[PDB]
Amino acid sequence: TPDIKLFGKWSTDDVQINDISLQDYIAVKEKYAKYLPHSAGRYAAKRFRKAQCPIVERLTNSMMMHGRNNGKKLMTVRIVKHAFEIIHLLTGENPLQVLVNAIINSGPREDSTRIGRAGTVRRQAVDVSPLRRVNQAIWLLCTGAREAAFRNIKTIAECLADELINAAKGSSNSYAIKKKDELERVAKSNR
Amino acid sequence: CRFYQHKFPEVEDVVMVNVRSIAEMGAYVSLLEYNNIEGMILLSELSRRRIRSINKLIRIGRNECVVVIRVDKEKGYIDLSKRRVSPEEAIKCEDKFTKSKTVYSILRHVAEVLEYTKDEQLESLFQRTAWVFDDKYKRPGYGAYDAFKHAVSDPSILDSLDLNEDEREVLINNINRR
Amino acid sequence: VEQKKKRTFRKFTYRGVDLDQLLDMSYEQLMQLYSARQRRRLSRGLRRKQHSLLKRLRKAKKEAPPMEKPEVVKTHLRDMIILPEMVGSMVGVYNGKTFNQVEIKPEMIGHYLGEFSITYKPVKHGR
Amino acid sequence: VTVKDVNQQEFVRALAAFLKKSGKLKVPEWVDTVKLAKHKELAPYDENWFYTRAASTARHLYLRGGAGVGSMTKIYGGRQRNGVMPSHFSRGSKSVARRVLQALEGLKMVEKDQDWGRKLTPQGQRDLDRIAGQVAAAKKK
Amino acid sequence: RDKLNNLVLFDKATYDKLCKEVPNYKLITPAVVSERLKIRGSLARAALQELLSKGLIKLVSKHRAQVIYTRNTKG
Amino acid sequence: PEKFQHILRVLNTNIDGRRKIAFAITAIKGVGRRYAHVVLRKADIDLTKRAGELTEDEVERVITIMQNPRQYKIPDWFLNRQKDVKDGKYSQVLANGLDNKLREDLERLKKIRAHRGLRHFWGLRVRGQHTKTTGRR
RNA sequence: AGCCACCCGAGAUUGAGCAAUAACAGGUCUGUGAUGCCCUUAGAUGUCGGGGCUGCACGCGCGCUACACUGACUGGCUCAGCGUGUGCCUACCCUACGCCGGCAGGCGCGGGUAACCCGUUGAACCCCAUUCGUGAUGGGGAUCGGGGAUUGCAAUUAUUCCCCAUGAACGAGGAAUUCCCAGUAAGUGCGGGUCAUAAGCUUGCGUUGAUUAAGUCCCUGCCCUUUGUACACACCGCCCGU
């Protein structure tokens, strides 16, 4: 443990952080070697505290939405650590590294901001932040988890693991691959 | 499925979609010339001028004569156009689809006439009846070759589509019934 | 206008006590017997100093001939559950605007007099 | 030691079997049909919770100086689902929870003691620490 | 909205398939079993306990919401 | 994997594997989820299981218990009607007979023209709670 | 003058208290023995009884529960904080415990105006084992039933609780609309108040606890000028002609 700290049941090591912009917004083993994702119970104290929070801890944060599910991280970290188990038995890979790849293919490249042109709808081909690229990755990952479980035999962990695996390698069966591309569609589009 | 042997629309394919439900940016509209395949519209480019209204009594279930900009044959996203449309008037494709609904519905039981609908072995149902016209070149060819069939009394039992049941209990009455 | 096998085709027990036996009973038994809301009326309300009206209930029953109903016994109170000695009186029940005269029968035992008198419309709006 | 050193959820089930090893745990005449709590939408699945509840009571009274009827009624209940109204914590039946208490007093697992109610029996201090070791040697959660 | 029902009967045709779909099984939750079969999801649990009793599959999670099984130790 | 037991009838309904046994008993009147919890436990039947199992011979005993509540120690208070206005002792009423007695109460309350009947007949709410905005739309 | 950075850290980061100028036909005579003018005045407008303030084709607001699996179930584990509470001048507690009753509740006392008892306040969320399996399903609890406690002198017009049972919309909510940057949102219970009984009211509290601006005047409003004004009660101003 003082040599290397791993995940609660997985390894923070053997994690392939393989994007260009998303360096040091995705870290699980670099400074963020955590068996237990919980920093202090707040993550909006600073704008800096976004990159302080790792993607494994923000996933436990960005899940508890939907007011009956708000204020429940203990249900969440249960279901989140359940979801890593459902990754590995479907993959065999490090389920953190699957989650780490899930941020990669779900992060956009160019998006669009609104602009006006002659009354007609045009949108400006802009980059988004690699902070936002992670935040557009996680939020689309967190959307398909509770939604697909909401009237199905599958729990959120089974839907979130399918959400991570199909976004670890873009299969267009996770919600995050399917909605990133519509964001990236408008950049090469209008004007 | 569909009476087209081809699965998907092509580039600049003027297609007749089905407005199922209106969505966030637009509506996930599903083609009916090709089977049930979903396509999308606005935000980007469907309209040309600005008068700022969409409906008064137009409730649901519409059909849009739209032109395929982008088609994702793997992923499943068909981007559609009407802003580009100067010549692709909606009346021609729908009246063709008003035929091509019946052209499909003639060729999808079949299953010597009860009719059922549904279902036979769906892909093999059309290679024997529906796509064998689409195989029969050209595409203006089976615009007339299918019309040769449902001109039923001019004549009934001539050139092939001798496939497959025999077919002929359908070919007498179920063409006139469908 | 009196007790059982008369104004009763609705037979056996209203709440747990048969009206056929109840009219042969006293109501000091009925408050003990299967009449909880009446029990809270007859034990906590406990013969609630309407005695001059209760005399009048037994006066007008006596003053009228017993083959006929009493003349008039008006009350302001509408919280009165019909007792077996009450059964037969044509009781004027006041709803805060009007006296409603109700002959009280073996079927109506266990019911308050504000249940036959109304303070409220079958609401219209032009309806 | 205490019984707080060993696994409490194993403890409420190993002592429940120990109250089945007692053979009697003085069940009330009404568990097949009862509400048993205004918290519960359903009647219990069985009657063998009553051993577990007393296995949850004798563990509770091992730690106290003594408690009784009102103290058990806040332990096993929770949010009373108020339907169309907001749910709130309250206390269910005070008879079967007292029936638990008179049982463990009758078996001398707990016993009427100081601090207003039932504290551990020293035999119970044995038999809890006996099955605490049975809890501890088996598994340690 | 949604209206789905599995077969809410203990089903041999599903369970004999479950004993024979088992090399495809490595992530074995009862919901996966209730979707790979038409077993209920409630009755998927008890059927997998029988398939656990065969020793073909192995518990890797046991939570009060849902258990997870896994066919032989690594694959 | 035990298929072959799937026909049951609890009065005027078919009781197959659709839910748990007791919750499938709830298809009829006079039998809620807790009352069906009891009658199977008066019959000592695991209501956890499926009504596509557990054949009618257990259920024919359950028929005798739902018809005889106090006789099988389903006590006086647990009943849908305690100390009734018709059959004046403590009767748990069942599938088709409760729909009688729910009417037989209220049709009596209009012959008596008591306040329960007067509210229920006049389009009004039986309860004295507010009906200005609710009980309508 | 100030900023940024970091040190320390409780950092240059808590939340309120609080109000200038001026304005108000803001609201209150029904808070006021603050009230002018009146009204009526023994036939009251000083009273009691009864009833309506609750009524519903409906218009609107605020709440609340719902729409399942972080949910329902059955239980089990166990963690608060704010306060408060009988002995009070128009009417009175917290309750251990002991007991009975499924419960409703009954009940026996005793403690305690109180960091002394209630109350080692061992709350809920949580947490686990389940059953359930996403099925208007057991989610939902509308509605109503029978009956029982309970408060009251009186509940009937269900005061309230309970018991089972009848078992509804609702499977996510248009037009619109609301709020808000950390213990915040939300979720959760709890204390205080109105009371004889009688909350979905309310003020507090802790608790579990998110994503997100971290910017801007874009919306929008506010301050700051210039400019023009036919406005001056001031653009909902003016103001034309048919």
Side-chain angles (χ1 to χ4, degrees):
Chain A
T1 305
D3 290 331
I4 184 65
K5 291 173 68 177
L6 299 178
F7 184 72
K9 74 183 184 73
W10 298 108
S11 296
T12 58
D13 290 334
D14 199 359
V15 161
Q16 282 74 245
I17 302 167
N18 289 326
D19 197 357
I20 303 300
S21 300
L22 301 185
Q23 54 187 358
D24 299 327
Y25 294 98
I26 300 168
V28 70
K29 61 184 177 183
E30 295 176 355
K31 187 64 178 176
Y32 300 154
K34 295 179 178 66
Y35 293 93
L36 200 278
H38 184 195
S39 294
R42 78 268 180 93
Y43 300 95
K46 295 294 183 182
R47 179 179 170 179
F48 295 155
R49 195 170 176 86
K50 294 181 183 177
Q52 296 175 1
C53 181
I55 53 98
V56 294
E57 184 174 359
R58 197 176 301 112
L59 182 62
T60 64
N61 298 317
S62 298
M63 183 67 73
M64 42 178 173
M65 302 303 159
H66 185 73
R68 73 101 182 261
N69 294 316
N70 281 115
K72 291 181 183 180
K73 192 174 71 174
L74 287 81
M75 293 291 173
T76 301
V77 174
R78 184 69 176 175
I79 291 168
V80 168
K81 287 180 181 290
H82 278 294
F84 292 114
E85 179 180 359
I86 301 165
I87 291 169
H88 178 78
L89 301 170
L90 289 171
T91 59
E93 295 181 354
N94 191 3
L96 300 180
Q97 190 275 135
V98 170
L99 167 60
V100 161
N101 292 325
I103 312 299
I104 296 171
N105 295 112
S106 305
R109 298 297 186 183
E110 289 186 353
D111 291 330
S112 291
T113 184
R114 192 266 305 160
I115 204 166
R117 188 258 185 272
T120 62
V121 285
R122 299 291 179 183
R123 284 179 65 193
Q124 185 183 4
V126 294
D127 283 321
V128 285
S129 181
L131 180 61
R132 291 292 97 191
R133 285 172 179 180
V134 172
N135 292 315
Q136 292 307 111
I138 294 174
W139 184 253
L140 296 176
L141 288 168
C142 292
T143 306
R146 292 181 289 111
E147 180 181 1
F150 193 70
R151 297 298 297 166
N152 211 175
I153 320 158
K154 301 190 288 182
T155 59
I156 301 168
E158 305 187 3
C159 297
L160 191 272
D162 184 75
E163 188 71 28
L164 295 186
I165 294 163
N166 292 319
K169 305 294 181 291
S171 298
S172 297
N173 302 116
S174 65
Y175 184 80
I177 302 299
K178 295 184 286 186
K179 298 299 289 178
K180 181 193 74 65
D181 298 330
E182 299 174 354
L183 299 172
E184 287 182 351
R185 192 263 176 196
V186 192
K188 188 61 69 178
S189 301
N190 300 317
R191 193 260 299 164
Chain B
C1 187
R2 82 277 169 194
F3 80 104
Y4 284 162
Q5 186 181 3
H6 196 192
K7 291 180 179 181
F8 289 158
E10 63 184 1
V11 67
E12 65 181 1
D13 198 359
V14 45
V15 296
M16 187 57 69
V17 299
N18 206 167
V19 180
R20 301 177 300 169
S21 178
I22 302 169
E24 294 177 353
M25 72 287 197
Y28 291 103
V29 294
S30 294
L31 274 78
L32 293 176
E33 289 289 327
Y34 298 98
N35 188 7
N36 209 166
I37 304 166
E38 294 177 353
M40 68 277 197
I41 52 170
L42 295 92
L43 76 162
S44 177
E45 285 177 355
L46 201 74
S47 297
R48 292 177 65 89
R49 63 176 293 161
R50 297 184 291 111
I51 56 171
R52 283 87 70 192
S53 179
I54 188 167
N55 54 6
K56 183 60 69 178
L57 296 171
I58 301 167
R59 294 186 290 268
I60 52 170
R62 298 301 301 160
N63 291 319
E64 294 293 327
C65 184
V66 287
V67 175
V68 176
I69 296 171
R70 180 66 179 172
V71 54
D72 293 333
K73 298 180 289 295
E74 182 178 1
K75 189 177 289 294
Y77 289 98
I78 299 170
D79 188 74
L80 298 166
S81 178
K82 193 179 178 180
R83 188 190 65 74
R84 189 182 297 167
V85 172
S86 178
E88 289 91 3
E89 188 177 2
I91 307 300
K92 296 179 177 67
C93 183
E94 184 178 1
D95 186 74
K96 195 262 182 182
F97 176 70
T98 304
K99 297 177 179 66
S100 294
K101 178 178 72 173
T102 64
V103 170
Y104 171 69
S105 296
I106 279 169
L107 296 171
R108 60 101 186 82
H109 35 287
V110 43
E112 177 179 2
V113 48
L114 292 179
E115 74 186 8
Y116 69 98
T117 317
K118 64 181 179 293
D119 195 66
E120 211 270 338
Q121 184 57 256
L122 190 64
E123 179 180 0
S124 177
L125 190 58
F126 295 154
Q127 187 177 2
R128 67 185 70 187
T129 55
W131 298 351
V132 69
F133 283 108
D134 199 1
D135 184 75
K136 195 169 180 179
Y137 64 96
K138 289 184 180 181
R139 287 185 175 179
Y142 76 102
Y145 291 158
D146 185 75
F148 179 74
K149 174 188 67 64
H150 63 79
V152 184
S153 65
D154 193 9
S156 178
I157 49 95
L158 208 61
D159 199 3
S160 297
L161 201 71
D162 52 355
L163 281 79
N164 203 2
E165 188 71 28
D166 187 72
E167 198 184 2
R168 294 291 183 266
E169 183 66 31
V170 162
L171 193 60
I172 297 297
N173 194 5
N174 208 167
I175 314 299
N176 290 317
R177 180 56 194 156
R178 189 79 265 171
Chain C
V1 188
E2 59 183 359
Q3 297 183 358
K4 63 179 177 183
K5 297 294 179 69
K6 185 181 286 185
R7 297 182 298 173
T8 169
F9 187 76
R10 299 288 187 182
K11 55 184 178 69
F12 293 91
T13 81
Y14 79 103
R15 194 172 178 180
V17 175
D18 190 7
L19 56 92
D20 292 331
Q21 185 61 44
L22 196 157
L23 296 165
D24 300 333
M25 288 182 178
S26 67
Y27 62 95
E28 291 85 5
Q29 301 173 356
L30 181 58
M31 56 174 287
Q32 301 167 358
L33 290 172
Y34 290 168
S35 68
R37 304 293 181 183
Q38 183 180 3
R39 183 176 300 116
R40 299 287 87 78
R41 189 189 65 89
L42 286 180
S43 63
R44 301 190 189 186
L46 195 65
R47 284 78 182 169
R48 68 284 304 150
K49 279 78 178 175
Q50 59 182 359
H51 299 292
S52 297
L53 301 88
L54 291 169
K55 285 176 185 179
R56 183 179 177 180
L57 286 172
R58 306 293 182 268
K59 184 177 183 292
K61 186 71 176 178
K62 180 178 182 293
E63 289 173 351
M67 291 295 173
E68 288 83 2
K69 79 279 191 185
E71 41 180 357
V72 163
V73 278
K74 285 182 175 181
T75 68
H76 264 67
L77 293 175
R78 56 97 170 266
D79 56 355
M80 297 168 70
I81 283 176
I82 298 155
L83 301 183
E85 287 81 5
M86 285 182 179
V87 170
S89 296
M90 187 179 175
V91 183
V93 186
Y94 192 66
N95 288 320
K97 70 276 182 183
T98 49
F99 294 96
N100 303 111
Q101 297 186 359
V102 176
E103 292 181 353
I104 57 180
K105 69 183 178 180
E107 295 177 353
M108 288 181 180
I109 298 170
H111 303 284
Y112 291 90
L113 286 176
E115 298 187 358
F116 318 107
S117 71
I118 57 169
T119 69
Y120 62 100
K121 306 286 104 175
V123 183
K124 67 180 177 66
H125 294 281
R127 295 184 291 168
Chain D
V1 289
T2 175
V3 307
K4 283 164 71 179
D5 285 329
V6 309
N7 310 317
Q8 75 268 15
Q9 194 66 42
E10 293 182 354
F11 202 86
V12 301
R13 297 177 181 176
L15 190 62
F18 186 77
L19 295 170
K20 295 175 180 67
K21 288 177 179 66
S22 298
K24 304 177 294 297
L25 195 263
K26 301 186 184 69
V27 293
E29 294 294 325
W30 54 97
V31 188
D32 196 78
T33 183
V34 289
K35 184 69 183 178
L36 196 84
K38 57 188 180 183
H39 307 282
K40 304 294 182 292
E41 185 179 1
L42 191 67
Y45 287 167
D46 281 324
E47 293 85 5
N48 293 319
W49 57 271
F50 195 79
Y51 295 95
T52 301
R53 174 167 290 174
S56 304
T57 300
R59 181 178 173 89
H60 185 276
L61 300 178
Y62 191 82
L63 313 179
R64 300 296 178 273
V69 175
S71 297
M72 271 58 251
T73 51
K74 69 181 178 68
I75 297 299
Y76 308 112
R79 292 169 71 186
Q80 180 176 0
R81 186 179 296 273
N82 292 115
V84 76
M85 296 171 183
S87 301
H88 288 285
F89 174 73
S90 65
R91 294 181 178 183
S93 177
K94 303 184 294 298
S95 180
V96 294
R98 183 180 65 248
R99 183 67 64 194
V100 161
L101 293 162
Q102 300 171 358
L104 298 170
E105 188 186 8
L107 296 174
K108 297 299 291 183
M109 295 303 294
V110 305
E111 58 183 3
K112 282 291 295 295
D113 291 328
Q114 63 179 354
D115 289 332
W116 290 103
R118 288 171 179 87
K119 198 180 174 66
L120 56 94
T121 307
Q123 180 186 3
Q125 185 175 358
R126 190 175 295 109
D127 293 332
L128 270 73
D129 291 332
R130 287 297 187 273
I131 75 103
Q134 299 174 0
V135 160
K139 288 180 71 66
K140 291 183 184 292
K141 76 182 182 178
Chain E
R1 290 179 295 167
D2 292 330
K3 180 68 176 177
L4 188 275
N5 284 113
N6 296 113
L7 297 175
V8 204
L9 177 59
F10 280 99
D11 288 327
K12 185 179 179 181
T14 66
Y15 180 69
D16 292 337
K17 180 176 177 293
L18 181 61
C19 294
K20 295 174 181 66
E21 195 183 3
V22 81
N24 296 317
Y25 278 101
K26 291 181 180 179
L27 186 271
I28 314 170
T29 73
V32 169
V33 173
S34 184
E35 288 170 354
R36 289 182 185 178
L37 309 173
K38 292 301 291 181
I39 198 66
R40 181 60 167 173
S42 301
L43 309 181
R45 303 183 73 186
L48 290 177
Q49 289 171 357
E50 298 171 353
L51 191 62
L52 181 65
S53 299
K54 293 181 175 65
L56 290 175
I57 68 176
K58 175 180 68 179
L59 281 169
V60 288
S61 175
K62 61 176 181 65
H63 183 64
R64 61 190 177 90
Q66 194 173 5
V67 298
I68 304 170
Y69 292 85
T70 297
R71 194 256 308 168
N72 288 313
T73 301
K74 66 175 74 173
Chain F
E2 300 87 4
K3 300 179 73 69
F4 300 96
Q5 298 178 358
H6 53 87
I7 273 174
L8 300 174
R9 180 175 179 180
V10 176
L11 296 174
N12 298 317
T13 57
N14 284 318
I15 312 298
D16 289 329
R18 182 62 176 79
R19 292 185 299 270
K20 277 165 67 175
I21 296 168
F23 296 98
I25 309 304
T26 62
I28 70 167
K29 285 186 178 180
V31 174
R33 62 186 293 166
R34 189 185 293 266
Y35 181 72
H37 194 86
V38 172
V39 178
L40 292 166
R41 284 177 64 188
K42 297 299 180 183
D44 291 327
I45 297 174
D46 290 331
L47 50 98
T48 296
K49 292 182 180 180
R50 295 292 180 264
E53 294 180 355
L54 273 299
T55 62
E56 301 89 359
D57 294 331
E58 288 86 4
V59 173
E60 285 174 351
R61 177 179 60 192
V62 171
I63 289 168
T64 60
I65 298 172
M66 65 178 73
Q67 293 170 357
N68 297 319
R70 302 172 68 189
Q71 289 75 245
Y72 287 92
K73 291 183 179 180
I74 303 166
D76 299 330
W77 55 270
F78 196 75
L79 309 173
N80 58 1
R81 298 187 67 188
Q82 306 169 2
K83 288 183 288 185
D84 318 344
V85 193
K86 294 179 185 178
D87 291 331
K89 60 180 185 295
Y90 288 125
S91 301
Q92 177 69 43
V93 206
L94 294 174
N96 50 6
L98 182 63
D99 184 73
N100 297 112
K101 294 188 182 67
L102 292 174
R103 292 173 291 170
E104 286 173 353
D105 290 331
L106 295 173
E107 291 292 327
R108 175 191 55 79
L109 290 162
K110 188 65 184 179
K111 183 175 175 181
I112 297 175
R113 46 86 45 69
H115 186 87
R116 300 287 187 181
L118 295 176
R119 290 289 189 179
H120 187 74
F121 185 77
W122 291 348
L124 302 171
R125 180 174 285 174
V126 170
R127 266 61 168 170
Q129 62 184 357
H130 291 179
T131 320
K132 185 174 183 68
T133 65
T134 71
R136 69 170 186 82
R137 186 59 186 170

